[PDB]
């Protein structure tokens, strides 16, 4: 009683060792009676003399390269199989044979050609002892024959010939006629694998029982180099019954090398191909909703990833806790991911960036600001000698450039800059330098989050002559704060008569939604200028929710929708990031150049990076999609270059578009 | 092998002197028969790219797996938070010595203290009081108009509060970053700017504050002087915790108006012989002899590193003497199941309530886990040579003129 059965239960890429030894590994062993199969080496060691049966099915996932899989007996190939189609989802290298083995003989599968980048999930390797030898029984009947040569057929419409007979227990297989004559009544098993090199013609191979076909198989379709017509069956045969293979259709030009034909007497009478990880701040509930919506939308799209569903893992972290970010990111990489999406502040960005670079996991970083405060650059140190796996999805912070340009247009010479309590003033360090260089008089003040006590304190604290100085100074101001704080701040100064009809204030923030803009205008009493980021979105409200054939959930694209009107900017980028990845994976899959995800280990100074990471990164980096933000793509420096600002105004006595800004064309309009 | 007293250390690749002094401190303590009388201190040191917070975390985790009683770090803010957050998770007391980039004046890290959670990070260097000190001095001189110059590594958030206050008092304050190559900066300037701008610029430079490392300041002072952008009536202030005696002498030499120098100072004994002792504890002469080239070239972090090793040794000693030792544990980092060091809470409390006299003066921690002790001296010279004008500390305030 000897039998084994092993399968590949995971999509994961081959190990370093598998690449070096070329021995095909099977991690899950379903059967191992006698423990004669070494699961670690994936090799079967024959415990005794007898005839053994082997069958294997090696699956080639989205791979362009042709592969050759051979069954090895002590370092010598017995049977080989090919799965070299060049444009196919999944193709299998399958074959089987009966061989005689001595005690201690080693059987295993070797990858003679190509590689298993895309992994080989569902691949199988099993085998068993048909009967022992030396230990006697007329119930020992088996044969096995292969075609060892490329030679053309012998004036063959006719019977498929096999010149090399490996097994012939009972001498019931007539090698000259390639016909099996059943010596007795019983159930018989037959398997055949006929390889037909693309002779520009389809073939039909049938197993014949006394001139009548039992089972049939077809090959010779497609332009695949080597393809096999395979099938198998159990049939009852009487004494003298003749079983053989007939070529019912087509021809075997190019020879049929590697073709196999065997048979014997039985007795006489989860884990997906596409997985991404995501790390979100605890404040990023909307990022998570939109992320999931994007995945959902793409999974409904029959034109993108047509036969593969996207799965994901999400973890929320305290974005002020960079170790937890790293910790949770590491856990995702252990599961195995193709990419990491993050939506987090700068505090944890660097830890994640540095992790991504170490593990070669492409990292798509969406910067979030604190409490809607205007963004300031993170200052993520790019890798010089090393390759940088982090892609910055949001564009560079151009706030300082834009505000300077606008201020220059208005010919301001004296003004005050107000910023909220979360803003990072390094964002305007360059701005402050330039205004000083031009000799302007620029005051700075942080605005506390409670305006009421700030301004009340002010009147008490400051004397008259100070307030008069202060009033004058407020005639021209810039607010670098979140709209909520600005709303409260504008109202309180207005109501307390610290500004008047002649004032002119500028508010600048990437993120100010339509509801905020309307409310700011309502609250202000002089001239107001509002500077915010804008996203090129189609005319005809119907086409807003599509990009080509891709349908976007109406909740994100209907600008009458409360969600849409309340979305954070990061939410839009998250959608396009999922969108961009899907197209990147699609192209990689379509081109048949897939490299599988790997289960990585973080805190192991020995641990290696993902061997697939470099090619995936390059593919993602050169990707581009049309989405909610407009165009998302990356330049040579790994960052999104596309950004647009609109400039709104109203002199009171109602808001309108004054102009537009972008970093290539510059300012347009007044 | 495996000793009873083991500590870990993480150093920036730039922190070679921290490492030397760390090892010297351990060496000195091991010779001291009055501290840890029957136990030798052993340690593990790892250098990391301080701009690589994952590597910091990675290497820190490896140390914790070996098993340590405490983690000493000498690193910038970039990796501090990762280490702080790790320390809190693993309950490993973490003694953090902030290093600035290229001798640039320090700005606060903004390390988020744990509210509901206990914070295992101790800040060994005092809070950054630069903004308070510079404001106080400027107020004393009755300045109303001046320019602030800062180097290319300085974090201007350090002066955000200062900028707020000068604006509130109605002053006219200009800001400029000074590029690391002054020669092309000033050459560019004369070409670029026209006459009437330079006249405006010259006037503005009559009163200036430099918030930069002394090397850049040296070059900057010389180039402006030689190019006649300042004159005898100017008054410049230089402020940096770290300006050694050699730097001060050289700055004075290069300046041609009034110069004020503001730097941190360390209360160190009279009688040069007793400088190298604290009680029975002997300090290597290379650190305490102020004629020694090393001593004169030490970074401030180097002094704190010495006192940190010193402080830990006394903390371990007291814990051992009181017969209340809790052993180090081999911890695992990336294991969401992994537990913290059960000894960490008591060790942290002991270290936190510790205090030693060392090279920095007194090192100790307040209720908030941070060193409160700091002193600034204020030096001056009107040209035609440097002398002490006054002193500043955050409790008594300004003393002298
Ligand atoms: Ca209004
Ligand atoms: Ca001089």
From Swiss-Prot, chain B:
Outcome (variant: residue 2 to A): Reduces binding to CBLN1. Abolishes CBLN1 binding. Abolishes synapse assembly. Abolishes cerebellar parallel fiber-Purkinje cell synapse formation. Abolishes D-Serine-dependent long term synaptic depression at PF-PC synapses
Effect of substituting residue 342 to A: No effect on CBLN1 interaction
Extracellular side, ranges: 2-401
Domain of life: Eukaryota
Site for Essential for dimerization, residues: 54
Family, per entry: Belongs to the glutamate-gated ion channel (TC 1.A.10.1) family. GRID2 subfamily.
Protein name: Glutamate receptor ionotropic, delta-2
Gene encoding the protein: GRID2
Residues of the full protein shown: 24 to 428 of 1007
């Amino acid at each position: 009683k000897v039998a084994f059965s092993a399968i590949r239960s995971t999509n994961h890429e081959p190990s370093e060792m598998s690449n070096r030894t070329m021995i095909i590994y099977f991690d899950q062993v379903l059967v191992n009676i006698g423990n004669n199969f070494d699961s670690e080496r994936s090799t079967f060691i024959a415990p005794r003399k007898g005839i053994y049966s082997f069958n294997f099915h090696v699956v080639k996932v989205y791979n362009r390269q042709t592969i050759q899989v051979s069954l090895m007996l002590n370092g010598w190939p017995v049977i080989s199989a090919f799965a070299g189609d060049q444009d196919v989802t999944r193709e299998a290298a399958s074959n089987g044979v009966l061989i005689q083995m001595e005690k201690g003989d080693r059987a295993y599968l070797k990858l003679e050609r190509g590689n298993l980048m895309g992994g080989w999930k569902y691949s199988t390797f099993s085998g068993f002892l048909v009967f022992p030898l030396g230990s006697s029984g007329s119930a020992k009947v088996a044969f096995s024959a292969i075609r060892s040569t490329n030679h053309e057929p012998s004036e063959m419409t006719m019977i498929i010939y096999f010149d090399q007979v490996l097994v012939n227990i009972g001498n019931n297989f007539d090698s000259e006629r390639s016909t099996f004559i059943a010596p007795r009544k019983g159930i018989y098993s037959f398997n055949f694998h006929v390889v037909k090199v693309y002779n520009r013609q389809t073939i039909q191979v049938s197993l014949m029982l006394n001139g009548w076909p039992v089972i049939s198989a077809f090959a010779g379709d497609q332009d695949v180099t080597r393809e096999a017509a395979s099938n198998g069956v159990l049939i009852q045969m009487e004494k003298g019954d003749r079983a053989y293979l007939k070529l019912e259709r087509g021809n075997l030009m190019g020879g049929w090398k590697y073709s196999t034909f065997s048979g014997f007497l039985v007795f006489p009478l989860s884990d997906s191909i596409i997985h991404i990880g995501a790390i979100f701040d605890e404040s990023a509930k909307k990022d998570d909703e939109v992320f999931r919506t994007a995945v959902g939308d793409l999974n409904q799209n029959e034109e993108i990833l047509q036969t593969e569903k996207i799965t994901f893992s999400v973890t929320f972290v305290d974005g002020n806790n960079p170790f937890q970010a790293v910790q949770e990111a590491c856990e995702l990489m252990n599961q195995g991911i193709l990419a990491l999406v993050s939506s987090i502040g700068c505090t944890s960005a660097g830890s994640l960036q540095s992790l991504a670079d170490a593990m070669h996991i492409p990292h798509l970083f969406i910067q979030r600001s604190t409490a809607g405060t205007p963004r300031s650059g993170c200052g993520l140190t790019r890798s010089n000698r090393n390759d940088d796996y982090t892609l910055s999805v949001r564009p560079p912070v151009y706030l300082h450039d834009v505000i300077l340009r606008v201020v220059t247009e208005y010919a301001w010479q004296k003004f005050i800059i107000f910023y909220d309590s979360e803003y990072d003033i390094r964002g305007i360090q360059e701005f402050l330098d330039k205004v000083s260089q031009q000799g302007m008089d620029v005051a700075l003040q942080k605005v506390e989050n409670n305006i009421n006590k700030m301004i009340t304190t002010l009147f008490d604290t400051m004397r008259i002559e100070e307030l008069n100085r202060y009033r004058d100074t407020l005639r021209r101001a810039i607010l670098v704060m979140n709209p909520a704080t600005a709303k409260s701040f504008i109202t309180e100064v207005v109501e307390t008569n610290l500004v008047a009809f002649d004032c002119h204030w500028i508010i600048i923030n990437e993120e100010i939604n339509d509801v905020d803009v309307q409310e700011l205008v309502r609250r202000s009493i002089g001239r107001l200028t509002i500077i915010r980021q804008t996203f090129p979105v189609p005319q005809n409200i119907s086409q807003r929710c599509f990009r080509g054939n891709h349908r976007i959930s109406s909740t994100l694209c209907d600008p009458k929708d409360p969600f849409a009107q309340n979305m954070e900017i990061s939410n839009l980028y998250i959608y396009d990031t999922v969108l961009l990845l899907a197209n990147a994976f699609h192209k990689k899959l379509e081109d048949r150049k897939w490299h599988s995800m790997a289960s990585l280990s973080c805190i192991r100074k020995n641990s290696k990076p993902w061997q697939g990471g470099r090619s995936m990164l390059e593919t993602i980096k050169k990707g581009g999609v049309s989405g909610l933000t407009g165009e998302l793509e990356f330049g040579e420096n790994g960052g999104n270059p596309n950004v647009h600002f609109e400039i709104l105004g109203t002199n009171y006595g109602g808001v309108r578009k004054l102009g537009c800004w972008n970093p290539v064309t510059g300012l347009n309009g007044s």
